[PDB]
């Protein structure tokens, strides 16, 4: 399954050049791929689904971050090597450099509760962009990291009991 | 032995004298009548055409043919333009239909009957309802430059130029530039398109003697403005020229340098910069505004004669101000109002380059808060 | 003289002046037009539109060019629409063929009051009888206007208009044919309304007030009176697959004279002259065996062994059948499986350094560590182990025009050799073409005959099993079930054979789609896959093709100075009481000038016109900043077998990418481009581009975004976007180009556009063909002419003689001399001065003339060999012809052929019975239930995504009318057609005739109907479900029954469906006319 050949490249390219960068149409076109890189569309839907709880700084960040992600994906999906590690590398690189230059740390520091009550733990174990947002989110504030780990510890009891004995078994 | 068969509206040109087993007879319908076949008993068929052959079998005929008349359509359109069709008999062959024109359409032609001809279609209309627009309504404060427009005979799509009389103008230009020429043309319905000249509003005074002003006619024409040397009477002439200028809160905060003294503008802003102050003196609060209302921006209250009697900083209401989301192809339900310029037209499909509307929250309903409520779009 | 209007697409159109009384009841258009390559989709030629109305703007008539498949714009046909003021539906009449973009077409459409007809080049093509009455009322006479070359919505026309003519009465086909031969020199008649030859446009025509009148040129419609172009058959490829050119090489024996054909052997050595690819005794044994098998066929081979020493090429593996894409692709293949290919890079081994090299990052490929030839298989390495032969010919860059090149290649497959090049390929004479062989089989005594098989593929002979084994589908245009000159191998002597390896006739099998027992199969022939012993000789109809491609394509190989003969007999055009006029074809290779080497004389045409293809092609790389790769498949003459299906022999913007790379989209403001360059830069006159494949949608209206002509002085003259077609080559006429053009640049925005070739036609008298001496034809007679007549040489092809006698026969043949050397004579034409010929107009069926008009033109319904065309019928003594598949009248011959015009074809062992007293459910005033009775008319065409059914369909069909579109989709109801029958017979097949498939314009989901069956005093016997198709428009439903269960006398058939759009015209019941299984099993 190491090649995106099984899903027509033209099918994902024609949809990309047909869609617009303003909405979630790019990630909607992108999700049906031969590799399993699903999860950008869910991030777009969750960010444009709970926009009411975000402040003006947060809504401006969400608008500009989804705009940059859509435009950068349509821009650098042109010429790339066709292998799933390269697709993962370009997706994670574009997502990281999109979140770092639009002040994700500022949006974490402003309204932390909305951005950390959106963990989606069950979705995380099978969506790499969710893991990307998690490992970029915690580097801003220490109380943000402690709150999101406190939420994950309850979500262990929701989902998996072994993680509560694995992750707590540190520095002892 | 078969009975003798007679079929209506046809020609039974057959000579089966003995109607035994094999009485070969032929049936052909007349002109303007098509053939219907409701068979009884048959093995093989052949393409006879407009006629048919009917055979005797066991004392009965193998086919039950009937030459039903052709059906012209009920005339809805495509025959006479802008007319009502009243067929008194029906829509079969030989029927004739009568049509009468609408009220503003004269008729030319002697014969005004449509005949359902032998081809199954209506005949050619010998008279066509000539569409001519009538005399225009005489719009006041206008000059009838075209001499033919005072008559009643005008073709559809005529160009009558009406020039407004001095002191009046067609709307569209402000008090700086004067335009008084506009075009009114006959529509395809037959009525003239509406257009009128409004009077030129006399120029507003400086705010030094405003509030205590008593103009003779106000914002109408020839209004002399004078409060209860210099300029004792202000003549609002045809050009609207002001000959002489007038001669002698808890939330909202304004720090004027002069204060009680006159002559200085004050910085007008609320406690938080996210809110915008507007002048709402007619008992309308912050949340009581509708979306189609268009309040004005806050004017910096210069101190007039006496105490300020201009809308008080209290009458001026700090409302939910605009946010920097204008023209980014995103519709905002908060800025879906006429106060913040309808978010730059982003909430209306006719002013978006992507020809689409995307509400910022997924839940927002497309016919609710984030709907195109702008009448200046292509939705109306 | 005669002047014509060149209409561009830029907006030039005209309008008839107000002083002309437009035709009201009956009219006849007669226009000589020469359309260009790619028009617009609805593009019109002459219309009569409504300009004072707004309720309906589709009144009047319009003649133009429009594609019949508007969803895809695949094939463009001439059309003639008409909608009178009385009628309610505009009906179009098309042509029978995609139009020719370079021929003058006498398009003429008539309408009398009942039948409107369209005449393309004199033959009646399609006729519809739906429009009735006059086309407008006389009250609105002043309102109708007539437009030429366009409409108010700007359906502009790109091409010529030569002699416009409009009539006040309808003229039949005998008057149309008389107007073709007399051109425009016509006298005054009361019926003749407007007869315009463009000497004064402003007297009768006025242009648009904003646009410009089109420019008036000089052109002649009567340029040829004998058509020199012969179409190859439906599964041929060249001029010598034609039936009457290969036959002239079979009856005659002076066309099979001894020919010495040169060939070379590419022998590779190292840098010390000691180790060969083929030994000297292998070459010596082969050549004496090669000339042994061809000395009985007048073909001799002159051998010139070329030895090229290169240790880089010699030491590495050379392979022929191994593609380069499958080396990178992980799908396995037998053609690339070697130790020097890495076992396809590990993609064929069962296990999925010598074993760790499977695609060590340049460690095993750099020469400083190990040898490159041991363990390097990188497909983008500068040095690798496998070498494709198409790269090897690029490395050598040999000469193919003066020799036949034989290369060598080791292959893992090796059941055959490498792929030989056919003579009709673009590399037939280029350096990339030749024969690739196995070097360890060439000259070995067991496999000597595999070189003769590869030679015959290179000289135009197909396999004997091409008509049986190499059949991709049994619905093929040609499949050799009967020996013929136009089916399969195109040889009458070769009986059909399947793919066999054993000698003798094969055993029977079900692999063959249409035969079971093959007798006298050519086991002995070289073209079979038999072994060395059982292959001995060629059939004598396979030496007519071999002696033909050595005249057509391979004239340069043989050192004989004898020119190519005129392969067709002279044709008689007309005669009088004293003289007979005859013309003949140009010689078979097509060259109109003497073969002078080192010049342009192999490219000029008749009249000093240089026609050349693209010599050098370049295009920027998509994934590189300054790549500039050179495409090759967009250079030569256009070779695509299917001109609308995407192929591999074209240039695509996404063809330049690596197979392991996502292709980038082309840039916005200019697009990706292809830069072609021509060998001889000339002042251009026309430019034709073979755009083969276009994606189904485009953003801009034209698929080709921009075309910029380069120049020697650098002035890039630009041309606008053009609307291209899939089938028809795009053709552009270039005015005012005063500078010489050495190449074009074709900017495009479509990602999957497939440009195939290009052609730059020079001007009328080019300054490069001026040194080419023309070849002269001499004509001899069997009673010989005088010395004053027979001595002179005719530069033209037209010859007349005066001394004739009214009784004696005369045989004429024409030789084609170039200089001193005189070629072989043409086949003779037996002419009698009293009797007729094949242009007399008196059909004489004793000589085999099926039809006889005076045309001598293949485009009509009667060919120039007195043979009627494919799907035509000629019905007069001067043999006016018509197209009978689309007409509404069934004939005696048409019953076995046209199912769509003469009803359903009942098999000879069966009998059809159509329904009577058929009852439905949703009977209404709009759609009653008596329409199902009897045989339906088959003239109702299928509905492709029908949106509305408000027309007159229910008078000749049945669809439900009480339940409309929204209630049928929501509530999910059902409708049934409870059809009865009259004579109780058993059921063998149930036929249901549908006027539509039920497919909606919006809803694309397929819908299925049910074909039940009812009988006397029992329940049912279900037959199943079937989906609806237009090509299966009579939907035959085969009855399933077991012989153990006793039979049932069928009485009724019920058809049920839930979708509202399925319309039934009539059901049937096929039974046995031989025996009745009820009184048999009583
Ligand atoms: Zn072969």
Author numbering:
A (entry chain C): 42 to 213
B (entry chain A): 1134 to 1361, 1371 to 1390, 1405 to 1536
C (entry chain B): 13 to 364, 378 to 384, 389 to 1111
Structure paper excerpt:
Next, we recombinantly overexpressed PAPP-A in suspended HEK293F cells to biochemically study the enzymatic properties of PAPP-A. The conserved core catalytic Glu483 residue was mutated to Alanine (E483A) to avoid auto-cleavage and serve as the loss-of-function control. After the proteins were purified to homogeneity, cryo-EM was applied and a final 3.8 Å-resolution half-density map was obtained using a similar strategy as for PAPP-A·proMBP. The map revealed an extra component in the structure, which was then identified to be the co-purified endogenous STC2. Besides, Cys120 links to Cys652 of PAPP-A and locates at the PAPP-A–STC2 interface. The interface of SD with STC2 is similar to that with proMBP where Cys120 of STC2 is linked to the same Cys652 of PAPP-A, and the interface of STC2 with CTD comprises a hydrogen bond involving Met1518 and π–cation interactions involving Phe1481, which also resembles the CTD–proMBP interface. In contrast, the PD from PAPP-A·STC2 complex is only attached to the SD without interacting with any other domains. The K128BP5/K120BP4 anchor residues interact with Asn683 and His781 of PAPP-A, both of which are exactly located at the interface between proMBP (or STC2) and PAPP-A. Thus, upon the formation of the disulfide bond between Cys169 of proMBP and Cys652 of PAPP-A (or Cys120 of STC2 and Cys652 of PAPP-A), it is expected that the binding of the anchor peptide would be prohibited.
